[PDB]
Amino acid sequence: KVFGRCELAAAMKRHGLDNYRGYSLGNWVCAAKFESNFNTQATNRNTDGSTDYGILQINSRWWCNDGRTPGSRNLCNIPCSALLSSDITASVNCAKKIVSDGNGMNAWVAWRNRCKGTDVQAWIRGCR
Ligand SMILES: C[C@@H](O)CN1CCN(CC(=O)O)CCN(CC(=O)O)CCN(CC(=O)O)CC1
Ligand SMILES: C[C@@H](O)CN1CCN(CC(=O)O)CCN(CC(=O)O)CCN(CC(=O)O)CC1
Ligand SMILES: [Cl-]
Ligand SMILES: [Cl-]
Ligand SMILES: [Cl-]
Ligand SMILES: [Gd]
Ligand code: NA
Known about the structure:
The chain is mostly helical. It has one domain: Orthogonal Bundle (Lysozyme). The chain is built from four helices and three strands, in the order ααβββαα.
């Protein structure tokens, strides 16, 4: 599924992401835009053999099982394929554990380089 901006904000807000660990809703929509272009089905292969999955490009090295990332962890206890669903529940619960782990939203390279220090509220501007 490719989400609209307002549609994704209302779904992330309903799953409790708004101000989660002090990160306003604008930071999360911004991250999703530059990680996946709002597409749940996005995948990107990393040079170490791990793969990034879904709207927030979560990372088979540590967070989920794709059966092809040797000696990796599954700390969200999910198949990576669950992170590609039109339902973002798995992606959101998994992101709650990542952003809680010590480095906050710096875990998302595109958030750090394209959202951090900007007018992030612009990303939910006009939404009900
Ligand atoms: C809401 C309208 O803006 C829709 N829109 C009309 C055309 N826009 C005009 C403009 O945005 O000023 C220019 C192109 N636009 C650049 C950009 O958005 O930054 C990329 C495509 N957009 C992406 C989007 O808007 O989400 C969809 C089409
Ligand atoms: C040409 C306009 O589209 C100018 N636009 C500024 C104003 N936009 C317009 C809008 O989308 O309504 C509102 C804020 N916008 C939200 C979003 O696009 O998702 C993020 C910033 N954008 C990033 C981008 O377009 O890639 C900068 C370019
Ligand atoms: Cl915001
Ligand atoms: Cl594996
Ligand atoms: Cl933090
Ligand atoms: Gd824009
Ligand atoms: Na794994």
